[PDB]
Write an enzyme that holds these catalytic residues in place. Structure first.
Site, PDB file in Angstrom:
ATOM      1  CG  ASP A  34      -2.325   0.807   0.820  1.00 31.54           C
ATOM      2  OD1 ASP A  34      -2.444   1.435  -0.276  1.00 31.54           O
ATOM      3  OD2 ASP A  34      -3.262   0.702   1.661  1.00 31.54           O
ATOM      4  CG  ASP A  35      -0.888   5.229  -0.838  1.00 29.53           C
ATOM      5  OD1 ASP A  35      -1.665   4.445  -0.277  1.00 29.53           O
ATOM      6  OD2 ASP A  35      -1.206   6.348  -1.256  1.00 29.53           O
TER       7      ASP A  35
ATOM      8  CG  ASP B  69      -4.413   8.208   7.624  1.00 27.96           C
ATOM      9  OD1 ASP B  69      -4.214   8.561   8.841  1.00 27.96           O
ATOM     10  OD2 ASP B  69      -5.033   8.931   6.762  1.00 27.96           O
TER      11      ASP B  69
END
Lengths: 139, 139, 138, 138
Positions: free
Chosen positions: D74-75, D78
């Site tokens: 994933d980027d 969060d």
């Protein structure tokens, strides 16, 4: 001869292709041709608001493929060159809208749309192959 | 139609032009056509090891010009379009080697060399006109 | 550790400098210090709408006069040797740089980014996008 | 203050991650978390010589199996909501991200860059080179 592609210019061309694919509501999803189509697919997914993204991975060996005949899908690759992969993708996903960023003459008529023409004897150097690096002066 | 130019690609094309200008020892200096030729001139100066860089500034009004007939100089502009400036520069510096990065058809034969062909009705968007900026999704 | 300047970061800095130089109408022109000042001068010339751009090449060639009404721009003030020569020949110019180190910072009228004296700095015209082999060759 | 990621910085980070993932030969493939993982997966696929790349789309679509022998990328982690779903369905995958915030960082096997929980982050696929008017219109 080389044709150098930077990240920013790949993105310019991919956003131009996304604009041609509007309205987004006509599409069910995107299928990326691995590996070249992965980055373009990410840009199209962002621009079109499409979260259904799948892949097709071929060497002829199928490593992995998205199911179905491509109805309501965009299939995206970075380049169509000789058209080997392109002939197989048409056959597997005959109802997809098949698009690339770049096309060489031999595999221009094997896609439905592309952005940039490249001469047949030119190697395309994509930005995932490069880094910004010190270069000695040519002198 | 637009043709977008990023900093990295301007530099690729300018370094390709510098390679064509080797060996550097044939040249006394570079004259930049202001404003478009300033950044290309900086790249050529770096690559060729040339520290004698001057300018010509025209609107026909001459704001400022380098002296002489251009013998042993490279004269560089970013683009030759209709060829208005180009006709005046040839006349002022008839012994220079006049080069551009880009050429449109109307002002292709008014320069000695250029790197990239651009169609006549296309606006070239140079990187000094742009910034990396958030863009709303096209959707 | 190398301090690497990208084209886009250089342009961000040069636009910050351009804003300080408003109103643009107050200037007769820009004098670039060859070679490091040429790209910064191109950016200032765009941002300020200034077509009168000249050069000083250290003396191989110089713009005439005492610099009154001119911006003189360089990329970096390092030791201050160039800066010393610029204040001598263009005492009435507004002399600015993108980067400054302490040794030279007293010799310029303005700068954008200060860096430590020891910094190993590479500008964007010293680098290019270049093939690099993948980490695995498989 | 916006934390802006460029394409080239994202690639620097992804290459640092790729080096940790050597030997490449140990992996069956890469699973990208749509959409944020697609560009990082493309970079890993290049660096690791891996052509078997699949996706998970949160469930709209998923790669089959328990993740054994896969990298899942994933980027950004969060809040940790996606991460929670990935560990549930791919318990034997090596789950990595480019960026991590603290709330989610316990849920990933590896990350490259930590950032504060409050960071306003924009990725390179959210931005593009765009005309901006000169600071002076003269």
């Amino acid at each position: 001869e080389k044709y150098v592609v930077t990240w920013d210019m790949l993105q310019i061309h991919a956003r131009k292709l996304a604009q041609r694919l509007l309205p987004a509501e006509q599409w069910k999803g995107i299928i990326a041709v691995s590996r070249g189509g992965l980055v373009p697919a990410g840009i199209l997914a962002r621009e079109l608001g499409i979260r259904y993204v799948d892949t097709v991975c071929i060497s002829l060996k199928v490593l992995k493929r998205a199911e179905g005949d491509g109805e309501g899908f965009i299939v995206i690759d970075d380049l169509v060159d000789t058209g080997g992969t392109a002939t197989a993708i048409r056959e597997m996903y005959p109802k997809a809208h098949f698009v690339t960023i770049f096309a060489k003459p031999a595999g221009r008529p094997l896609v439905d749309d592309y952005v940039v023409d490249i001469p047949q004897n030119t190697w395309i150097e994509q930005p995932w192959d490069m880094a910004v690096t010190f270069v000695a002066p040519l002198s």
